[PDB]
Amino acid sequence: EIVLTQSPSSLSASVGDRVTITCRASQGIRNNLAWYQQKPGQVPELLIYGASNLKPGVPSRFSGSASGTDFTLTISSMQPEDVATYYCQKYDSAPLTFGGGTKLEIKRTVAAPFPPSDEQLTASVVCLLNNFYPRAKVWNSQESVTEQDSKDSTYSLSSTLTL
Template structure:
């Protein structure tokens, strides 16, 4: 099990309220800390505590309650400056192990994820192509670390195609309400990729689904090319066969034969070969003189 577990991904409260942020500490280590990451990305130390002794706090509005299994932070009279991400941690030897964080927001001001849009809506592709699906959404800056983007292929064979967390290939603007985008690229596609794809964005328990992208793989294109390749192979095979037969005939008539002499040709045995669309034309000429015995 995890040594530090923060029970709430996001906490929303009204200005002036008292807020309690809970943290479970499944660890033998006694020394715990709370830090806050503000909107400007700075890390602020709030409190330190050995659960057997009185905790030390940096602001009279903060206080912590600790036991062997938990360390909770209380913020009195919440203000706008309290908005941010709060991390609970334990000292383990020389390291600090932090929880996943709890985002504190003002109630009613923002939602974790807004307006999930997919583009394009329809893709027509040929077998072997590479296609890119795009998913864009708006997210609170504090919640980006807790954001999950999942691509699902729907239908009778529904399956998860891709699953990304936090900032793993999810690109967001560096603003308070950030526009984020995640692209999914499918390479060397076949008829197996034919179907409808949904982008599912989840942040702190809130889930939104995109408007869907449909991929149609033109299998008929592949069949037409197979027919074309078969025709070209058959044509090449036929041409090669004709050339071999002509060569054999030439050798046969040039070789002296009993009862036949003075073989003369009016033209070379193989005069010229014209390749037309699907045709082989051979022009040759020869004459034989027979002598009676």
């Protein structure tokens, strides 16, 4: 059975780079491979149909490439806006198998950056720190290391300890 292996699963980009992703398959799918873009927090959207053709909605910068065995989704230039998760799909036959979505990022340097409420006095203690990149260890708790924000320039962390 045809398996769709999308690599890399995590993509690190800079201020200057051209996105290049591959999608290995174990059999022949004609050219019925679709590349989707999903901005996190929203429903995905279609980028390229046929692995080389462009959607009228999307611009011409995100230019596809040929498909010998692997399928390359090139992009002319890297911009702060293009941070999403890119997915494969094979609409060639009945099993329309997906894969993994590749998060993009924008380059930036290395930077550094709550008593419990009286009604519950349970007791929860939280700590705050913000505006750092990359994705820092910080005072029984459930640490919530939040994903770097959609800008990828900055984000914040917050974790709670319950007494």
